[PDB]
Amino acid sequence: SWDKDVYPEPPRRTPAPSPQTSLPNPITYLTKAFDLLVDRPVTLVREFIERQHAKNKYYYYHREFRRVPDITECHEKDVLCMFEAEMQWKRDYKVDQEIVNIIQERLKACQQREGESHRQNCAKELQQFTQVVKAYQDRYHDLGAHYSARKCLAKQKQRMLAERKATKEAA
């Protein structure tokens, strides 16, 4: 399985055929042939593997963390503080990359399930895609290659200062 919380799926809508023919039905003959040929021993191999690993078990977990406080709660030098701040920041950056990955995967799914109803029931998912990617363009984009953490925060002050003065004069 997986988490349908994070990976939503639409309700299944399967139509039913209706012959109205006397061929009679070659493709049903062949799909029953495929199931009764391939599907039995592969399921039995699955059963064998399940039991033989169901003798004894292992366990893997998810690595969870604490929270080191801030970068603006570190001073001008503070190597034993800035290090914690940057590593926490860079791990946030990596998991945000995978956030954008998952949203793009949802967009691919929306293109594929709709077929040629492109402009219906993909406004929601493409719209939230544009929202998160507007956020990502604003926040993590125009910083270049050698990001440390401080270039991000200088960008942060630059952006909010410029938009503050622009909405100040245009208020």
Partner 1 sequence: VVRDHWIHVLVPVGFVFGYYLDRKNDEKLAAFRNKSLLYKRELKPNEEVTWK
Partner 2 sequence: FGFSIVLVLGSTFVAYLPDYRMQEWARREAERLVKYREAHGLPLMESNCFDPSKIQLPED
Partner 3 sequence: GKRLFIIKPSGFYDKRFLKLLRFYILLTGIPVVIGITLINVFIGEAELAEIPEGYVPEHWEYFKHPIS
Contacts with partner 1, residue ranges (CB under 8 A) = 65-68, 84, 87-88
CB 89 within 8 A of CB 65: no
147 binds partner 2 (CB under 8 A): no
Say how far apart CA 70 and CA 86 lie, in whole Å.
Answer: 9
| Interface pattern 36-75 for partner 3 (x via CB under 8 A) | -------------x--xx--xxxxxxxxx-----------
CA terminus-to-terminus distance, the chain: 53
Distance from C-alpha of 110 to C-alpha of 143, rounded to nearest angstrom:
31
In the complex, minimum distance from the CB of residue 65 to partner 3, in angstroms, rounded to a whole number = 12
SS3 13: coil
3-state secondary structure of 129: helix
Q: For the segment 60-119, give every residue that binds partner 2 (CB under 8 A).
A: 62-63, 70-73, 91-92, 94-99, 101-102
Cis peptide before 127 (omega within 30 of 0): no
Binding site for partner 2 (CB under 8 A): 3, 5-6, 62-63, 70-73, 91-92, 94-99, 101-102, 128, 131-132, 135-136, 138-139, 152-153, 156-157, 160-161, 164
Summarize as ranges the residues that interact with partner 3 (CB under 8 A): 49, 52-53, 56-64
